[PDB]
Amino acid sequence: AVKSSPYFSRYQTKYRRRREGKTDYYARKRLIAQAKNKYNAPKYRLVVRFSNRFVTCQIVSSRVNGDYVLAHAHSSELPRYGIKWGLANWTAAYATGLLVARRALAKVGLADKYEGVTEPEGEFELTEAIEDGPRPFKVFLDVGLKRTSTGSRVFGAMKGASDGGLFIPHSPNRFPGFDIETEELDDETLRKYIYGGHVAEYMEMLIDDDEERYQKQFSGLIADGIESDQLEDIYAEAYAKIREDPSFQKSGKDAAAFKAESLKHTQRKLTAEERKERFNAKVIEAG
Amino acid sequence: QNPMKELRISKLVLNISLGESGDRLTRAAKVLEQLSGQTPVFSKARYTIRRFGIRRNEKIACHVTVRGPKAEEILERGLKVKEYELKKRNFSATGNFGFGIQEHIDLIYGMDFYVVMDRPGMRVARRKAQRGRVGYTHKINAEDTINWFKQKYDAVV
Amino acid sequence: KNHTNHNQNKKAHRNGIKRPQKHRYDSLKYRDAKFRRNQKFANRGTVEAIRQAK
Amino acid sequence: HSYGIRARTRYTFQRGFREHGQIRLSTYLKTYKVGDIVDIKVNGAVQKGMPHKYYHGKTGVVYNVTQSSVGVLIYKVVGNRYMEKRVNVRIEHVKHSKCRQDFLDRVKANEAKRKEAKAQGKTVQLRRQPAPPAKAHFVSTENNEPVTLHPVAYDTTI
Amino acid sequence: PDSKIRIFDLGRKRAGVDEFPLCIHLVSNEYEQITSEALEAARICANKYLVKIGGKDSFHLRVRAHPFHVVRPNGLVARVNIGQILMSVRTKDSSRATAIEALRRCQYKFPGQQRIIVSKKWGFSQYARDEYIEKRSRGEIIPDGCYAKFLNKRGSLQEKLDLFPEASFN
RNA sequence: UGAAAGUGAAUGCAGGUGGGAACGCCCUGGCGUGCACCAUCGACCGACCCGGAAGUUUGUCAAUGGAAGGGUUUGAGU
RNA sequence: ACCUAUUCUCAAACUUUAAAUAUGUAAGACGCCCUUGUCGCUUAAUUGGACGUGGGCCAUCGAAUGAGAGUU
RNA sequence: GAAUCUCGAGUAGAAUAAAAGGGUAAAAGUCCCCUUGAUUUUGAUUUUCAGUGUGAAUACAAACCAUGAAAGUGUG
RNA sequence: GUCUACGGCCAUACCUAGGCGAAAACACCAGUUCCCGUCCGAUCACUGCAGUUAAGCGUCUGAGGGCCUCGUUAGUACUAUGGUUGGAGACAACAUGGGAAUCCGGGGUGCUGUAGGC
């Protein structure tokens, strides 16, 4: 045999989220472990996660009973600010990171003191502290299981959040346009990624070379009548809208009404009297 | 049948095992290069065998993996060589198959084809994040591979 | 006999297993250096501010 | 004999059955202050900061707090006196004593009873008392008639 | 060291569980030790007497003390508690006297005190005679070589159904 | 105090804090008050590790000289 | 050679489990509650942490029993 | 099952310089990349203990660095 | 109530077979110019929504394996104390106390925290 009863008896399972493949506890330990001489000072973490259609950026502290979310911004909230398409690209990650940073600073009380960069030019800068004021709100990046390659969208979300006013310690070693050999960051290329350029040249090349593939990949943009040139102004306007009004608007859907609707779809657990009734009925029919 | 259940050639691996290193291994290597248009991989010896005079980590075999239309067309020429005839033993219980060809001129060195089959959804097993096991109803059997062989190429097993 | 532990526990308890004397203040020296430094400055200001209030 | 640091630690530093793997993170999310009474339970996976095998299962008072460890003061019998032993033990090998938390909960309750007694003008006895002898009570025989028992005859079961 | 006793079951060890209902145990009355040479000598005496009187097909003899304890290497002994069974014979109800006398003669090959006890359990099984009869009557006992399988409430249903067709699953 | 060359003990009422003999006041305590002794936090002196302001004349650019200030190191110190 | 459900019998350096006896610590005034002060440490932050001030609770003062106890 | 790589299962049944024991699975194992915390200077602790010394070790503090996107880790 | 992100406890959560899943979400999925990485864009990296709920995912079912709890085992084994107890001894009984484990049988097959979507 292969999987014997002794095997199942002595089998010890990994933690639930390790079984689900959602948490790297080796990295989580170092990310959340606070120095004990600092006591109850929380260690805020910028969790950046990517789905097939959206970007989820959260600011999370860790406690004994569980994690607590300080601020959040989902790329589905970008249509409010004008970004309707490409809600999962490098620039969408930047917009979500910017929105998270503004929301956290507003909730903390540092938005009017740490505005970050209003017009991101692609330069690598850290949010400097005030000489006679409070230190910037410190948050550390959490990439999860995403591999940390150069130009990764996890670093895009960090760059947006850092530009939003949050102090995220980092180096330009992973921003797009950074050359490993010369250790220099290409500010123009980073600005191109910040304003959605790389997609724009992609439409330009597809238009030039393969019109059919242009239609298939960018069906939403083509059907909505937006060209490659409009991307920079759209994202710049979106950043301005985010900065001027970063508040989160709660949905008006009735949770109780949909709970009642979903209770009908949710099948019930059957009773123990039913257990015995099916059992001896099966015994009778089997003889 | 659900269209998501269609069998598609995941990869097709060309392997040439000479048992000796040197110029023969290198000239066998660029034959893979000209055949597949890809840089081959030199496999190092797993164990030391004094009977064969083999030391560990010495380069002995060269293999390559081809995917997509090039893998399909190389499969086309291989099946044409074999006259679309393969034995029942040739199909793995997992749903894979392979065959060796004595001479490469017709596409001297003998070498092995191996076709790896899958269905769209096997990324769940081959990814890193949220890695899981492909369901039994989604797994491929030897019989399913033999059928998909027969209706695709009108082949006789 | 090279070794035994026969009469040793009796000898211990004749004068008892005595405990060290308890003091309210233990050395802030012999602790963390950074904490000791700041507690010096914190104590210095505290005694001065008490003196000024008095 | 050999007199190493971890001599005869095969069973005490061994990780529990089906308890191997990765250390839970509520250990790191706990806060320790000087004066806290903590238990020492050496976690075998973390080899750094391991206290000596004597201190496994020993309870002491925190005296120093560092970035990754805790200073615990323990009284060790050495000949004819308790000597103060100050071990620098990593927080993985440490846990809060529930006896202290039970005491602090009892102290809060006692203050609450004292305040309500003062407000009501009454006196409340806050000392715990040991289990007293049982009170006089009646035992009813209705539907519980006594069953007379006899010792059973000896028999060879096997 | 190699144990002197090598065979531990003699007679019709393939006999069915229903065929030999009576069980008689030679049980140690003292906390003591038994040597391997002592075990094999009593085994030879028991086998020789039983085959002489009732024949090789009238009994199943099982010696239950195994010489696993080493004495300080020179040999092996069997450490025995009080009330531990040393020898067991299952036969018909007729061979009760023969089995008792055979164990009585084999007592002289063992050191210390032993008692001959007619077990009320059916054969070598753990079930007493009355409950073995009643469980076999309502159909949860199926003979399997020298032992019998007992229906248990655990496990699947169809597999228990087609192994035990007379069983009445309420 | 240091191996020496040498230098050489008050920011304060010769400091705080905790407990404390005796006394005083109040109605057993409380309140002051705190000798002696310990626990402890400092201040000062010498070494040790930095830091080199004057000043001296000789090399002034330098040579020599050592002040303030910092270490949480040390002494059989004040 | 195996594989499967069983079966008899064991271990000082095999073991899931697991005592009795021993063993650690706590069981408050160096307490608790509130207010509020110093810091060059810590925090996004008088934010904490440590030490305090000024108050209130104040010998059933927080288990039993017995002893005066301790240090040179 | 194809003239050495192929995919299934695979709780560690392997490896971890060296005895044995403990620890280790997105590692503490295997490969790759960059490095010299195998550094300087204190004190405090642990173990053998007389709480002397030696040896070995732990937690820090003041510098200097390595590495990482970062948290952080690193005084063999 | 369902789904997503981050978790806490870390199998009542795992393994296996079968049947379902409305919305949104998630996943599979199209492609390789860009950042990036490979023998191979299959993994990883990047751009997107043309289809699919086939798989993952959730859930229901099996007197399923396992696991968790309760009872049985059983006041049993063992054990602290006690005797000028019994016995040649091995060992046993009693007195005042403490007190298991396997087999076996019943029940159970994840609970919950923060921020949200439906």
From Swiss-Prot, chain A:
Record-level GO BP terms: cytoplasmic translation; ribosomal large subunit assembly
Q: Which Gene3D superfamilies match?
A: 3.30.420.100
Is Thylakoid one of the keywords UniProt gives this record? no
Q: Which residues carry this modification: Phosphoserine?
A: 5, 76
CDD domains linked: Ribosomal_L18_L5e (cd00432)
Instruction: Name a single GO cellular component.
Output: nucleus
- InterPro entries xrefs: Rbsml_uL18_euk (IPR005485), Ribosomal_uL18_C_euk (IPR025607)
Any one GO MF annotation of this record: structural constituent of ribosome
**What is the annotated localization of this protein?**
Cytoplasm; Nucleus
**Which keywords are on file for this protein?**
Cytoplasm, Nucleus, Phosphoprotein, Ribonucleoprotein, Ribosomal protein, RNA-binding, rRNA-binding
Q: Which SUPFAM superfamilies match?
A: Translational machinery components (SSF53137)
Q: Which residues carry this modification: Phosphotyrosine?
A: 7
Q: Determine if Iron is one of this entry's keywords.
A: no
User: Which parts of the chain span the membrane according to its record?
Assistant: none
Tell me its family.
Belongs to the universal ribosomal protein uL18 family.
Complex and partners: Component of the large ribosomal subunit (LSU). Mature yeast ribosomes consist of a small (40S) and a large (60S) subunit. The 40S small subunit contains 1 molecule of ribosomal RNA (18S rRNA) and 33 different proteins (encoded by 57 genes). The large 60S subunit contains 3 rRNA molecules (25S, 5.8S and 5S rRNA) and 46 different proteins (encoded by 81 genes). Component of a hexameric 5S RNP precursor complex, composed of 5S RNA, rrs1, rpf2, rpl5a/rpl5b, rpl11a/rpl11b and syo1; this complex acts as a precursor for ribosome assembly.
Reproduce the miscellaneous comment text. Answer: There are 2 genes for uL18 in S.pombe.
HAMAP family tied to this protein: Ribosomal_uL18_A
Spell out the PANTHER family in the cross-references: LARGE RIBOSOMAL SUBUNIT PROTEIN UL18 (PTHR23410:SF12), RIBOSOMAL PROTEIN L5-RELATED (PTHR23410)
Under what name is this protein listed? Large ribosomal subunit protein uL18A
The source organism is Schizosaccharomyces pombe (strain 972 / ATCC 24843)
State the encoding gene: rpl501
Swiss-Prot record, chain B:
| SS bonds (residue pairs) | none
The GO terms this record gives for MF are: RNA binding; rRNA binding; structural constituent of ribosome
Question: Which SUPFAM superfamilies does the record match to this protein?
Answer: RL5-like (SSF55282)
Q: Which InterPro entries match?
A: Ribosomal_uL5, Ribosomal_uL5_C, Ribosomal_uL5_CS, Ribosomal_uL5_dom_sf, Ribosomal_uL5_N
Q: What does this protein do?
A: Component of the ribosome, a large ribonucleoprotein complex responsible for the synthesis of proteins in the cell. The small ribosomal subunit (SSU) binds messenger RNAs (mRNAs) and translates the encoded message by selecting cognate aminoacyl-transfer RNA (tRNA) molecules. The large subunit (LSU) contains the ribosomal catalytic site termed the peptidyl transferase center (PTC), which catalyzes the formation of peptide bonds, thereby polymerizing the amino acids delivered by tRNAs into a polypeptide chain.
Q: What else is known?
A: There are 2 genes for uL5 in S.pombe.
Family the UniProt entry places it in: Belongs to the universal ribosomal protein uL5 family.
**How is this protein named in the record?**
Large ribosomal subunit protein uL5A
Q: Which gene encodes it?
A: rpl1101
From Swiss-Prot, chain C:
- Single annotated GO MF: structural constituent of ribosome
Compartments, record wording: Cytoplasm; Nucleus, Nucleolus
Q: Which UniProt keywords apply?
A: Cytoplasm, Nucleus, Ribonucleoprotein, Ribosomal protein
Name the segments for region: Disordered.
1-28
- Among its keywords, does the record have Transport? no
Say which family it is in: Belongs to the eukaryotic ribosomal protein eL29 family.
Q: What does this protein do?
A: Component of the ribosome, a large ribonucleoprotein complex responsible for the synthesis of proteins in the cell. The small ribosomal subunit (SSU) binds messenger RNAs (mRNAs) and translates the encoded message by selecting cognate aminoacyl-transfer RNA (tRNA) molecules. The large subunit (LSU) contains the ribosomal catalytic site termed the peptidyl transferase center (PTC), which catalyzes the formation of peptide bonds, thereby polymerizing the amino acids delivered by tRNAs into a polypeptide chain.
- Kindly provide the name given to this protein in its UniProt entry: Large ribosomal subunit protein eL29
The root-end lineage is: Eukaryota, Fungi, Dikarya, Ascomycota, Taphrinomycotina
Curated annotation (Swiss-Prot), chain D:
The primary location reported for this protein is cytoplasm
One molecular function GO term is: structural constituent of ribosome
Checking InterPro entries in the record gives: Ribosomal_eL21 (IPR001147), Ribosomal_eL21_CS (IPR018259), Ribosomal_eL21_sf (IPR036948), Translation_prot_SH3-like_sf (IPR008991)
Location comes to:
Cytoplasm
For this UniProt record, the keywords arranged alphabetically read as follows: Cytoplasm, Ribonucleoprotein, Ribosomal protein
A Pfam family cross-referenced in the UniProt record is Ribosomal_L21e
Q: Which GO terms describe its cellular component?
A: cytosol; cytosolic large ribosomal subunit; preribosome
One GO biological process term is: cytoplasmic translation
**Among its keywords, does the record have Ribosomal protein?**
yes
> SUPFAM superfamilies, alphabetically?
Translation proteins SH3-like domain (SSF50104)
Provide the residue span(s) of the region labelled Disordered.
Answer: 112-136
Q: How does it assemble?
A: Component of the large ribosomal subunit (LSU). Mature yeast ribosomes consist of a small (40S) and a large (60S) subunit. The 40S small subunit contains 1 molecule of ribosomal RNA (18S rRNA) and at least 33 different proteins. The large 60S subunit contains 3 rRNA molecules (25S, 5.8S and 5S rRNA) and at least 46 different proteins.
Protein purpose:
Component of the ribosome, a large ribonucleoprotein complex responsible for the synthesis of proteins in the cell. The small ribosomal subunit (SSU) binds messenger RNAs (mRNAs) and translates the encoded message by selecting cognate aminoacyl-transfer RNA (tRNA) molecules. The large subunit (LSU) contains the ribosomal catalytic site termed the peptidyl transferase center (PTC), which catalyzes the formation of peptide bonds, thereby polymerizing the amino acids delivered by tRNAs into a polypeptide chain.
